[PDB]
Structures are given as C-alpha cells and as structure tokens.
Amino acid sequence: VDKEELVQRAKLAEQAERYDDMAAAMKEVTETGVELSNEERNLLSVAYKNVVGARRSSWRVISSIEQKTEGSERKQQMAKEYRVKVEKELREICYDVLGLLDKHLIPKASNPESKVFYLKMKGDYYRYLAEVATGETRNSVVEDSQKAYQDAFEISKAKMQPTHPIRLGLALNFSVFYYEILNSPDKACQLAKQAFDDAIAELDTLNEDSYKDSTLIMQLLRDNLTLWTSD
Amino acid sequence: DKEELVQRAKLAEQAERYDDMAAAMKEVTETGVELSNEERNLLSVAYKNVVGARRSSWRVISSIEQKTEGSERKQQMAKEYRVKVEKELREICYDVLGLLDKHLIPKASNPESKVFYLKMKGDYYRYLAEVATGETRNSVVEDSQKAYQDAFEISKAKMQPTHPIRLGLALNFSVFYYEILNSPDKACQLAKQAFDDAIAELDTLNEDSYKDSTLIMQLLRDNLTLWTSD
Amino acid sequence: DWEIPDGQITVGQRIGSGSFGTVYKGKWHGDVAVKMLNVTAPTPQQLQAFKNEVGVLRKTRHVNILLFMGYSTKPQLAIVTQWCEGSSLYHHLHIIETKFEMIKLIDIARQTAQGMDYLHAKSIIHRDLKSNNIFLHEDLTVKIGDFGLATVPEVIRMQNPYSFQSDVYAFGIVLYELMTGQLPYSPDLSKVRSNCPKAMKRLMAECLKKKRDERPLFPQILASIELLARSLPKIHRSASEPSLNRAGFQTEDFSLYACAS
Amino acid sequence: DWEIPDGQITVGQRIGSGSFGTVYKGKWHGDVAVKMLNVTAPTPQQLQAFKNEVGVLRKTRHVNILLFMGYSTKPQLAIVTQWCEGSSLYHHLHIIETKFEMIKLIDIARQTAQGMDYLHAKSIIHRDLKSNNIFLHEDLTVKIGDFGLATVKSRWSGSHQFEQLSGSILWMAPEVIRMQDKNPYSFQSDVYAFGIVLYELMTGQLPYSNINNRDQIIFMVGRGYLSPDLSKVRSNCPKAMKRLMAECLKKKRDERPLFPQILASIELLARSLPKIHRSASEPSL
C-alpha cells in the first residue's frame, strides 16, 4: 500500500527528530489525497508547526538584536543583511502549506470538523507572515486571514460542539490576531471571554480526556487575558 | 572581509541556526592566519552540533530498526532512512578534516594550540568509526589512535598537567578504548594515570583560572564507576 | 537575645493540632512558621520546658537543621522557625507515594545522617526522631526540624534511658523506610531494592540490632555512606569532553566571601 | 559559643587570595568555606576586624542572609561560613548574559529587600554593598554575604576612616565622597546602594556606562552633575517599580525612603503579570 509506506517514513522522522525531511515527505500523501483521516491529519500539523517554529523563534531573536543598535554601528546592516536571509526562506516554507491546502485538502473535506481545521491552518500561515510582512504586504495579507478566520467561525459557531478543542483553539488563536496585527484588545478581550465562559458552563457530561487538553488551553486563555486587562 | 566574517557566525551563535554558523567559520580559514582562541573555539561548538544533531538521530534510528522484528518491508523502510543520515554524516567531517590537514595543522605551530586540533582531528575519525562498517572500520580505528598518540605525546611536553586541553584529550582518549576498540583493561588505565596525575597537582596554586577544568575532573570520576562496575 | 518585641508576628492559618501544640503559618520578614502553644495559663512544667528548649536551639546553626529565627512569650508563648518550601518525608513515601531515583533516594540518607552528626557534635539528644518531621526544602536539601522534646530498646523497656546511641536504633528505621516504602508492624528480609545494594543491606542491619551497647557511632555512618555514594553509577553512558563554556569567565568565583578590587 | 576546636575543619582546595580575601574550601559536616588570614601575625587592625565580624555574624539568623557556622583561632583565624552553589548576580548579568524574565527580575529584587531589612531591624550597616556580593542558591532563592565591612550601631564606640580604597566606584554614596566626622554610613545612606543595584538589575546594563575612568565620576557624584540615567529602562518596567527607583537614588540624603517602605511597595506587585509578554497560541501535540 503506497499510503502506509509514505506515513511510516514520516512517523519515524519526527521520532528521530528531523522535521525538515518529514515536511518534505508528509505532504506527499496529499498528492493521492482521497480522504485525509484525522489520525494522520494532525501528523501534517505537527510537522509544519515545528518547521516554521524554529525559524520564527530564530526570527524574533534577530529582530531583538537589530533594534539593539548600540547607537548606530557601521556593521549592523549585516545584521539586517542576515535578517533578510531568514525572511527569504520564511516565505518559501509557508507558500507550499497554504498552497497545498486550497488545491487539495479544502475542496475534498466532507466533514465540517475537517473544514474548520484546514481553514484555521489556512488562516494561520498568514499570521506568521503578518509580522514578517512589514509594509503594504502587512495591509494586504491580514484581511485574507481575517476572512479565512471569518469563514472559519460559521462552521464552528453552528456545526460544532461548544467545547470542541479545535473551536476552542480557534478563538484562542484568533484572539492573538487582533492585538499584534490590528491593535485592539477590546475586540480581543470581548472575543475571548465569551467562549471562555461558554465552555466552563456545561463541563458536566464530557469525558476527562476531552476535559484534559481543553483545560490546557482554557488556562492559556487566562494568562492571555491577564496581559490584556493589564493594558 | 575578515573580522566581520567572524561576526556573521557569532551572530548566528545565539540565533541557534548552527548550519550557517559552520559554513561561515570555514570560509575565513582560506587565508593563512594561525587563528586565535576567539575563533578556533567557535568551530568546536559548531561542528559538534551539526554532527550531534545527526548523531543523536543515528542513535535512535539504529535503535528503532532493531526495536522491531516483523515485516521486512518496514524493516527495510528503516534501513533506507538509516543511510540518509549516514551518507550525510560522513560528508560533514571531511569538510572539517580536509580543511585542517591541508593548511591548518601545518599552520598549527604553537604546542599550546597544536595539541588542540590534534584532539579534534582524530575525534571526528571516532565519529566515523562508530558508524563505518566492514574493512572501512579497521582503516580509521587504526587511524584514530595514530591521530591520538601523537597528541598525547605532546601532552608530555605541554605546559601544565592541569591544563584543560590535556585533561580533555585524556577524557577523549579513554572514551575511545572502551567504546570503539573494546579494551576495558586499558580503559581505566588512562583515566587513573590522568586523574591522579592531576589531583596530586593543584596543591600550591590555581592562580590560573580553573573552574572549567574541575568539571572535566568530575566527568573522569563519574564515568569510571560504570567502567569499574563490570 | 533573640527576644523580639510584642506585636510583630502577623499570624495566619492553623497547621495541625495535637500533642505537640499548634502551628500557624506566620509572616515576619517573609513567611515563617510558628510553633504556638495555645494555652495562656502557664503550667509549671512549661515554665521549665520552654526555657531549656530555646537553650537547645540557640546553638544549632547548620544547613540540614531547620533554621531557628526567633521566639516570644509576651502576648503568647511560641517560637519562630523557618518556612520550608516543600512537604515532609512522611508526605513523600506514604501520603502521595512519590517514586524516586536510587542515586538520590540514598542521597537524602547522606543528608539526614549528615545533619544529625551536627547535633551530636554539639552533644544534643534528639530523642524523638521519626519520618514525620523530615522536611525537604526545594526537594534538593533535607531539613531536620520540630525536635521539641530534645534534651541537651531502652525507650520501649523504660530501663534517663537515652544517649547518643539511643536514636540510631530509630535512625535505621528512617533509612529502612526509604527502601521498601512501607512502615513495619524485624524489617530486614523485605529489602528487595531496585539497585539492590549490599552495604545498605549491611548498614541497615548494623543499626537496628537488639544489643544496645554495640551500636555504631555516628561519624562512621557519615563516612560509610559517602563511600557508598561513589559506587552507585551517576551516568548511564560514557561522556566526552563537552561543548566548552568559553565565555571569558573561568575562575572559581570567590566574591561572595570577600571583596573584588 | 561556637569557638571551633582545632582539627575538626579539613581545609581543601584554594579558591581565591586577592584583596585580603584568602578564601578556601572545607569539608566539615558538608562542604563549607573558610576565610583565613593572609599573614601569620594579626596586626591591631586585623584582630579588631575579626573581633567585630565574629559578632556581626553572631547576630543574623535569616534564610536570605549568608549562614554562619563557626570560627577557629588556634592555627590561624578562620571564619566558617556556608557554601552556596550557584553563581553570583553580576556574573548572571554581564558575563553569561542570561535573558531574565521580568517576573523573576523582581523576586530577585524582592528577596534582596525582604532580607536586607533583617540587617536593619537588627540595626546593622552593610557598609560596603556592591552588586556582586549577592549570590543565588541554585538560581531560585537568593543569599547575601560579604560582611567584611559590616558595622553595628556605633554611637558608643567611635570609628576612624579605614576606607576610600575599594572597587565600589559605580555604587558610591555622595556622603561617602564627603567623609564627615559624623560617620556618613547610615540607614538612609544604605538604600542608595540598593537603588543603583535595582537600576543595574532592571535595565540589564552596567551603571554609569559612559565612563573612561573615575576622574569624571567622583567630581560629579556629590556636586550634582553625575546621575544614574534610569530613563534607559527596559521595555517592560511596571509603573510602581518605574517610580520607586526615582525617589530611591535621591541626591537628598534624607529624602530617600525607609527600608520597610521599599519592601511594602514591591509586595504590591503580586498580581502584575502571570505569563510572558508573548501571548500564547494553540499547543503542539
């Protein structure tokens, strides 16, 4: 079976901890992508979250250093010249991800659970592209994500659980949008508090493993909110 | 040009992207410098991390291929991936090795520094000797000790019996004999001849800075217990 | 001279009540604990029990001893200890039953036999040691505390029936408890340990004996455990000369205890 | 009486012998340290220095101060302190360059104040405070030592100068520049050295950065032309901690606040920020 040999080569490349040679071989199940099941769906998510996750974490350290100008030296343009060298493969590591979504995964997904998953991840890689955008690109890519987030809501408001962790994670994710892109904590506080209270209410009949990870993000909503009420 | 070229990898040091850190350091070495201790230290943190990222994936891939006794397809699925790291791992070291022997070891003049690359010279040979197989294994193992003993002899004509390069050579020397050659009888001989050479020193003075050297000295006594537990 | 004036101790929440007295979670210059006696009518034994008890704790100043801070009797009689940031050892092995590692499970048994050796050097009889007052600050160090009845098989025979050699009959029961994790009731044959030592099987057996005269003295229980430390292996693989910490600072950093230029 | 009889302490490795601190390593009852006299003969200044410092470490029992264990006098005058593993604060700032969170930047700044009042409630002048005499115990709780110039309330026994040769130029009071007949060390003159620590702690920089030597410094400490420029503060300094250090390192020596006040302000910052400045995202499984 051509599928399982393509997932076994990508189920051990994260166990061996080398994601770049998994990201370039986890996308290959989409080329024959009849139906992505959820048990290998998030295998693609863990890959692409960690591949760019090293770069943007490397990106923030370089921006922290370049604005530490020490007055203005005659060398830090090379720090700015090195700064572009991260941004060059920042744009080349995301374009396939959003690129492979709308071509294959979104126009085959029959369940709305998949539809909110793929559209959220569709919206996400503009956000990591929002802070690196820095110009008129900043005021063009974020509305693409905004409607991608806004398309993500209706399939989650109706047609999803009040405590589904993808829906809870979405408003968790989308709360982080508005502050460091659109600069409005009042939208951010008012978006977070609702689903925060909507899921603490009726914690009765859910099993504890769904209660487990959802508390790992509901408490992440608290430490997110307390930064916002402080400013 | 030259000093800013050092600054490129030093910027990448805290940036935690070691691959470009390694590529910047070899590029300044084309000129004949006899590089100082602010630059030659940077390659050891670089190239141990480029190797060690591959090597720590070798140690789990060679584990997980033996962790199953099932289908031969999934078994041969591991062996095709276990060579991709292995073919990667060798090509890193010759970049180091072909650099240092062609110009840098002949430019390694001073015996406070000429001992230092000779430590690193045979050390990557051991890295190949963990993985290289067949008659290729025997042709570097005999080249490891040949690249080790001509450094340990300079440790007799070296300056201080507590100098951390002289310690770290012996810690690299003894770890060879147990792991690769599999000679546990000569294993504890090198550590005892090196630890007790040092603990009898450091009695009059340690005015030279030495907190780096004492953590090497704890490492010597640490791994000796499992070497003696058999 | 550690009399502090009345009206200083912001007292707090009650931690346990029983035969020892009572304990609040105080706060004076950072959070402290206070061994309070709730009574106000001073019984003539506690006219005498209090004045000798602070005569004990006025001298002990060491790491593994729970640091004596202060005392007062003017609004009410109590003493001010330190406030360890952790649970007891009775807590770790019975209540929550936390499994541990053998390279450290005896490295608290170095540090309870370390700290009680400071007691006998000052010639202080503990007389009431159990596991229930062995405290673990930050889970790294081990503090000894709450030794109130402490005067500066004779207990279960009433044959004072206490000496230096009278707590080591109980000190074996401390280190036995680490091995098997269950309190007895001759706890020897149950000693199947993970690393399974022999000297620990010996030194447990060479303290809990019946013949009370031939109990071993204490500084050969520090020295015969520090010897046993170096034969329990620290690492599970060989190591190499690590990625060196070349940073410009390489000396031993003496400047806590002296000046710098 | 903790006069330690000779033979109990077992001296091991040397650590440092520079500016009068001949510190060593011991092994009595767990690892301890020992400071001994350099010369074999104590002069009338050396014996007086030991005969107050054995008393000033008698008087301090608090966790966030350096412990005291004993003193020996038969072979040479030794002082048995504690042995704190870890690293200094000055090494943590400008040598290893550890990027400190602003949460654990004040629990360092609280516990150097919540323990220094125990020197002031027991009325000790920590006469020579620097930013490197603070020390961390396994990087989580702090310990302060170096009582090498520590004095008690000395209105009953007069003292001479015995000063003006130290490395404490970057934390030096203007009263220290004056050197009056009344002793310029005071409780009010102690918070200024606490203040320049807090500037050097919070902004993560070295105090009085633009300085070639001490030629321009000491002219302008007590005159009114050198000042700690706290406006080069860090990116996230909350408004209380931004404001106390304004009135802390005052030039007016009586305007500076009392020490139980400067604990009482920083204990109000309990609810400040639970998490980091980075607002979190969804987790990776």
mmCIF file of C-alpha atoms in Angstrom, chain A residues 12 16 18 58 65 75 78-79 82 86, chain B residues 4 7-8 14-15 17 57 61 81 85:
data_model
loop_
_atom_site.group_PDB
_atom_site.id
_atom_site.type_symbol
_atom_site.label_atom_id
_atom_site.label_comp_id
_atom_site.label_asym_id
_atom_site.label_seq_id
_atom_site.Cartn_x
_atom_site.Cartn_y
_atom_site.Cartn_z
ATOM 1 C CA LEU A 12 9.737 7.987 12.414
ATOM 2 C CA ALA A 16 14.159 10.636 15.194
ATOM 3 C CA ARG A 18 14.328 15.643 11.970
ATOM 4 C CA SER A 58 15.067 32.422 15.292
ATOM 5 C CA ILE A 65 19.263 42.255 18.350
ATOM 6 C CA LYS A 75 28.160 46.803 10.958
ATOM 7 C CA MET A 78 24.965 42.997 8.020
ATOM 8 C CA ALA A 79 22.665 42.041 10.877
ATOM 9 C CA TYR A 82 21.390 38.474 7.755
ATOM 10 C CA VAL A 86 15.683 34.270 7.487
ATOM 11 C CA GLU B 4 33.020 40.841 10.040
ATOM 12 C CA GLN B 7 30.768 38.383 13.329
ATOM 13 C CA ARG B 8 28.474 36.532 10.908
ATOM 14 C CA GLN B 14 22.690 32.882 19.712
ATOM 15 C CA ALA B 15 20.396 32.592 16.693
ATOM 16 C CA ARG B 17 20.930 28.028 13.400
ATOM 17 C CA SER B 57 19.228 10.870 15.272
ATOM 18 C CA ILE B 61 17.241 5.238 14.127
ATOM 19 C CA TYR B 81 16.464 6.024 6.041
ATOM 20 C CA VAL B 85 21.768 10.259 7.885
#
